[PDB]
Amino acid sequence: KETAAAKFERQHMDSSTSAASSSNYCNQMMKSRNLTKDRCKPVNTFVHESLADVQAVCSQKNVACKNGQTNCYQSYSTMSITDCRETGSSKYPNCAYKTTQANKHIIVACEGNPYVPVHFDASV
Amino acid sequence: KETAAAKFERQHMDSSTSAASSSNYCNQMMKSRNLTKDRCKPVNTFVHESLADVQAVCSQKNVACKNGQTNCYQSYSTMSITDCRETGSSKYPNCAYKTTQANKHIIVACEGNPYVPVHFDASV
Ligand SMILES: [Cl-]
Numbered sequence: 001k002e003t004a005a006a007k008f009e010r011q012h013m014d015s016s017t018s019a020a021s022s023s024n025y026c027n028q029m030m031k032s033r034n035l036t037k038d039r040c041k042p043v044n045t046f047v048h049e050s051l052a053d054v055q056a057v058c059s060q061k062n063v064a065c066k067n068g069q070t071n072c073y074q075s076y077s078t079m080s081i082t083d084c085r086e087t088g089s090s091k092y093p094n095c096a097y098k099t100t101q102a103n104k105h106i107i108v109a110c111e112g113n114p115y116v117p118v119h120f121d122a123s124v
Numbered sequence: 125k126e127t128a129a130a131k132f133e134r135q136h137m138d139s140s141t142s143a144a145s146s147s148n149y150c151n152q153m154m155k156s157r158n159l160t161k162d163r164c165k166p167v168n169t170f171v172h173e174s175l176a177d178v179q180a181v182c183s184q185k186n187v188a189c190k191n192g193q194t195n196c197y198q199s200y201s202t203m204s205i206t207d208c209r210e211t212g213s214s215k216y217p218n219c220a221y222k223t224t225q226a227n228k229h230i231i232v233a234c235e236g237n238p239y240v241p242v243h244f245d246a247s248v
């Protein structure tokens with residue numbers, strides 16, 4: 001079974017680009033990160049910063065998570081991110097995503113020792 | 125019982141300002157919109173555009189909702205928004221919120237006739 005930290009990395013980290021460079025970024029990334037296996041994951045955000053920078057958010061601003069838990073942290077700085085969301089034309093096994101690039105603060109839930117990101121809560 | 129459309133308006137519309145003008149905006153708005161009754165609502169976004177402009181999103185870009193439903197729409201343009209999230213010092217009945225102002229696309233779930241916003245899903 002995948003650890004929570006490893007699942008966060010697979011679903012939400014893309015440090016190898018500064019930004020989404022085209023409308024096809026999401027289609028490609030959702031497939032390659034194995035997020036379209038038995039169904040199309042409806043919504044998923046990738047963060048274009050180093051793993052270290054994202055891990056560091058866990059000691060930044062403590063804020064409530066949408067679900068009411070208190071282990072969420074908001075990045076002090078904006079980060080480059082890409083939101084991927086299924087379009088109307090999307091139908092498994094032919095998943096289809098809209099790619100929206102933005103520079104926003106991220107909010108992650110953190111857990112464990114080491115205390116690292118385990119869920120992507122939202123961007124602001 | 126409050127209708128879904130009316131609840132969306134109360135929780136998410138603030139057309140009377142162009143933007144959050146101070147760190148105390150959220151404390152004031154969460155109280156006045158009755159979002160701290162029996163407990164502090166952990167997270168809440170206010171949109172600083174006209175009601176008409178937000179309603180119009182329901183005929184803009186159809187995208188998946190985070191929960192997998194297909195009745196979400198992403199605004200074509202960015203809008204002025206303020207995210208309110210409880211801080212560590214927050215303890216009912218003394219709720220305390222961090223105010224974060226941003227200009228971002230909004231994503232809302234729409235329902236009904238008229239087909240209007242009933243949930244705020246996320247901002248991008
Ligand atoms: Cl996500």
Ligand SMILES: [Cl-]
Pocket residue numbers: 167168169244
């Ligand atoms: Cl919200």
